[PDB]
Symmetry: C2
Subunit: 404 residues, 2 copies
C-alpha cells in the first residue's frame, strides 16, 4: 500500500477528476446540488470524485443507518484522491438531545472512513448551523475547498460553519482578488507558499519576516507581486510598523492576517532555560495576539477581515521537548477560540490551521494498560464526591499517540 | 516500560512527597485539603507535582509553568503525578486569560511525553464559579494523586462549580451505593464490578444470558447480583427497574454502560447486520437504559452515569465505521444529556480506553507547504465569512492526536 501522488490545484482544471454524488436527507442536499451543478458533474441513480452525504436530517441515533446505506454501495466507485464529505448539524445547536447525539456521532464515522479510503481519497465532516438559511450559502466555500484538489492533505477533519449568508467571489479561482493579506514568516517555507498561494488567488501580499531574512523576503515579495516588510513581530513597534506599511501601500487597510511566523527552541522542560521558553512564547503566542489585537484595534483590519493562525499538531497532541512550542500552539488555538466571539461582532473571522508533517507500546507509558485502570477512572466518576464532574470524556490510554 | 504502581488498600497514595505550587485560587485549599493524607512539602523524590495555573491571566504569565517545573522535574519519582490546575478557559474573564488557560493543554500533553518511570501528567480545569474551598475538585485530585490513575496520562478534566462532600472513607467511596454494570460477565465490565465492590458498592452485574455463568461468577467475586438480559431488548429498562424495586428499594446510584460489541468490516463490505447490531448495543441501548432509568426514577439525585467510549470514537479506526460511530455517539450522549441530567442532580461522564491487555497518516505521506497554504487560503476567502473559531489540521489525517 504505497502513497498516491496527491492531486493538487492547477488553474483551469476541473475541481474533481470524477463525478459528484450528493445524497442524504436534510437541509443541505438541495442547495448544495443547486450550488455545485455547473462546476461539478453531478450524478445520481465514471468514478465518483466526491461523495457528499447530507446527515443533517438524521435526528436520532437510529437514523445513523443512513450513513451505511449511502456509503457502502458507492465507496467501491470512489476515484483517485476522491472526496468524502458528510455534512451535519452543529451538535450543540441541535433541536434535541437525540439529534445532538446522532450529529456528534458522525465524527467517529468520518474519521474511521478516512482510514479506510484508498488512493489519496479523504474524508471531511462539515457541521452547519441550524440557523443557516435554506440556501446554505455560508457553506459553499468549505465545500468547494473540500471538493477540490486544494484540500489534498486535509483529511478526517471537522469543519464548523455558522449561520451567516455568504456572497461568492467574482471568480472562485481568484477568490482573493483585490484583497490585502499580511503573512508573517513569509521569507521562506510555508510562509512563502502562503504568500504565493495568496498572490495566485489575486491578493496583494505584505510579506513580513525578520531583518535577517534579507533578500529571501525580497524574493518572496518579488515573486508574489507584493511588498516586503522587515520586522520583528515581537517588537513593541510591530503593529505601528505594519500599520504604517499599510497606510503607505494599501490605504491603511488589510483584509487578511496570517500569523505564520514561529520558532522552535526545543528542550525538555527539565533542561529548559528562560531564553528558550521566553523566545518561543514571544514569537509564537504573544506576537500573534498583539498583531491581531493591534491591527483590529486600530482599524487596519475591519469588516470582512480574516485572521488565520498557524497552530500545530504539537499544540493538539503535545510533543516531547516542546512544552514551550506546544504551549504556544495550543495558545494559538486559544487565540482563535478566544477572539472569535469578539471578532465576529466586527465582521472578522479567526481560524487556525494545524499542520502535521509537511516536507501497543505506542503511548507515553510504553505499555498496554490493565482493566483495573479503566475501572479506576469509572469509579472516580462514580464517586459521590465527583458531583462537580460531568460531561467529561477521559481517555484511559497511557497517553496513546493516537487521537484527533 | 515502568511497572506501574496500582492501588493497593492502605498504602500511601503517592510514593513520595507532594509539592503544590503556583499562584491562584487552588493552591491553599488543596494544601489544606490534602495535608493529612499526603506528605506535603512547602532530598526525597516528589510523588506529586501540582501547579496552580489559575492565577495566570495572560500569556506572559505562562512563564510560571516553567519557573515551577523546570527545577523540580529532575526530582520526580517513580510513577509520579504532575497535575496542572487551571480555570475553565471558556469561562475566563478575559480573552487573555482564556488564551493562557487554553494554552495549558499543549503544556501538559507535552510534558506527559517527557516524564520518565511511569510518571504522568494531567490537566484539570476548575470553574471560576467554584467556591474558594474548591471542594468539588478534591475527588479529581485524589484520583490523579494516587496509583488509581496509573494509565491515565495527558488528559484534561473539567470540574464544575458545585461543592462536594467527601465520602465517609475515601478508600470506600462507593460505600452503600448500588451500581448497575453492563457487559459485566467478562473483561472490563467484570473489573468495573470488582473495583466498585472494592469501593463498597453493591454491583448489579448485567450481561446476556449466553454469558450467565461468567456473570454469576462475576456477581459472586464481587458480592453483587447477576441480572442477565439483552440490553437492546425493549423490556430491558423494565427488567432492570423491577430488579431494583425488588432488591434496592427501586433505586440505583450508578449506571455504567460498558456493554459493547465490535463487528469490524470495511464500510464498503459491510452488511446491515454488522452495522445495526453494533448500533443497537453500543449506542441505542445505553441511550435507552440511561433515559429509561433516569426517566422512571430508578436513578435520581446523586446519580452517576458512566459510559464506555473508546479511542476509535475519538480518532477513528479502520474497519470500525460502525463501532467508532457508536463510540463517538457515546461522547454525544455524555455531552448531550449532561445539562438535563445536571438539573436532576446526576452526572454523566465517559471513559475512553486505549490499549488494554512522515508516513503515519491515512495519506501515507508528508504534505507539502501548498497544502497548508490552501487551507489558509480557504479561511481567507471572502466567501468563508461563516467560518470562524475553526481549528483544522492539515496532516493527511495523521495518526497522532489528542
Amino acid at each position: 500500500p504505497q502513497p498516491e501522488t496527491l492531486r493538487r490545484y492547477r488553474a483551469g482544471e476541473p475541481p474533481l477528476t470524477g463525478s459528484l454524488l450528493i445524497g442524504g436527507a436534510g437541509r443541505v442536499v438541495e442547495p448544495l446540488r443547486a450550488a455545485l451543478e455547473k462546476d461539478y458533474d453531478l450524478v445520481g441513480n465514471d468514478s465518483f470524485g466526491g461523495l457528499v452525504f447530507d446527515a443533517t436530517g438524521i435526528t436520532e441515533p437510529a437514523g445513523l443507518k443512513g450513513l451505511h446505506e449511502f456509503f457502502t454501495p458507492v465507496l467501491r466507485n470512489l476515484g483517485r484522491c476522491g472526496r468524502v464529505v458528510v455534512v451535519g448539524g452543529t451538535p450543540e445547536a441541535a433541536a434535541s438531545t437525540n439529534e445532538r447525539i446522532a450529529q456528534r456521532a458522525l465524527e467517529g464515522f468520518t474519521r474511521s472512513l478516512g482510514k479506510e479510503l484508498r488512493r489519496g481519497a479523504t474524508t471531511a465532516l462539515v457541521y452547519l448551523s441550524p440557523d443557516a438559511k435554506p440556501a446554505a450559502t455560508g457553506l459553499e466555500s468549505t465545500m468547494r475547498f473540500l471538493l477540490s484538489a486544494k484540500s489534498a492533505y486535509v483529511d478526517g477533519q471537522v469543519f464548523s460553519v455558522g449561520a451567516d449568508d455568504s456572497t461568492p467571489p467574482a471568480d472562485w479561482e481568484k477568490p482573493l482578488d483585490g484583497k490585502v493579506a499580511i503573512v508573517t514568516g513569509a521569507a521562506r517555507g510555508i510562509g512563502a507558499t502562503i504568500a504565493e498561494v495568496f498572490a495566485r488567488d489575486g491578493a496583494h501580499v505584505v510579506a513580513i519576516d525578520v531583518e535577517s531574512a534579507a533578500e529571501n523576503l525580497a524574493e518572496t515579495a518579488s515573486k508574489v507581486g507584493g511588498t516586503a516588510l522587515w520586522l520583528d513581530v515581537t517588537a513593541d513597534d510591530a503593529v505601528d510598523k505594519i500599520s504604517e506599511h499599510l497606510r503607505d501601500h494599501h490605504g491603511g487597510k488589510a483584509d487578511i492576517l496570517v500569523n505564520n511566523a514561529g520558532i522552535t527552541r526545543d528542550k525538555l522542560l527539565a533542561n529548559m532555560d528562560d531564553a528558550r521558553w521566553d523566545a518561543v512564547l514571544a514569537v509564537n503566542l504573544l506576537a500573534p495576539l498583539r498583531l491581531t489585537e493591534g491591527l483590529v484595534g486600530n482599524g487596519s483590519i475591519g469588516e470582512g477581515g480574516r485572521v488565520i493562525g498557524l497552530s500545530s499538531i504539537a499544540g493538539i497532541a503535545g510533543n516531547r521537548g516542546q512544552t514551550n512550542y506546544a504551549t504556544t500552539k495550543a495558545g494559538m488555538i486559544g487565540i482563535t477560540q478566544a477572539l472569535a466571539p469578539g471578532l465576529a461582532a466586527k465582521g472578522i473571522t479567526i481560524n487556525a490551521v494545524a499542520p502535521g508533517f509537511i516536507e501497543r507500546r505506542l503511548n507515553s507509558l510504553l505499555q498496554g494498560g490493565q482493566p483495573v485502570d479503566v475501572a479506576e477512572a469509572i469509579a472516580y466518576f462514580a464517586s459521590p464526591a465527583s458531583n462537580a464532574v460531568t460531561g467529561n470524556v477521559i481517555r484511559v490510554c497511557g497517553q496513546a499517540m493516537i487521537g484527533a
